[PDB]
Amino acid sequence: LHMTSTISILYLASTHLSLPVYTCDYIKWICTAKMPYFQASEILPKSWRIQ
DNA sequence: TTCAACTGCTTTCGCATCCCAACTACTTTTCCTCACACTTGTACTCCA
Incomplete structure (x- = not known):
């Protein structure tokens, strides 16, 4: 995936x-970065990123 | 019969070598995305 x-x-x-x-x-x-494709890891999960 | 060191005492309360860290590097952790060499027929005529 x-x-x-x-x-x-x-x-x-x-x-x-x-x-x-x-x-x-x-x-x-x-x-044009309308739908969150690029750098969608940053602000969306807020806790699943850290681990 | 004397010189020279060993001698305890001035007050009366209360004040008062080992570790750590810096920044910049290099590296590992893995997961994801495709190519490069091999092979049988078929096609275009090849020589019989």
Whole structure:
């Protein structure tokens, strides 16, 4: 499992719903850092990071 | 019959070598992502 895997399962659930989103948008949305892809370890768990 | 060291005493209460640390390095802990060499047919004609 990798951060490539949490976007892939975010895309399988998108290509189930017949959505006009594509992997162009999933690779655009993280470079603009809208959804928490890069450095998501920092502020989100707050206690599972330390151990 | 004398010189020279050994001698205890001035008050009266209360005041008053071993360890630690610094910063910058290098390294390990592992987990994740793919390639590089091998092989049978098939294809394009090859010589019969």
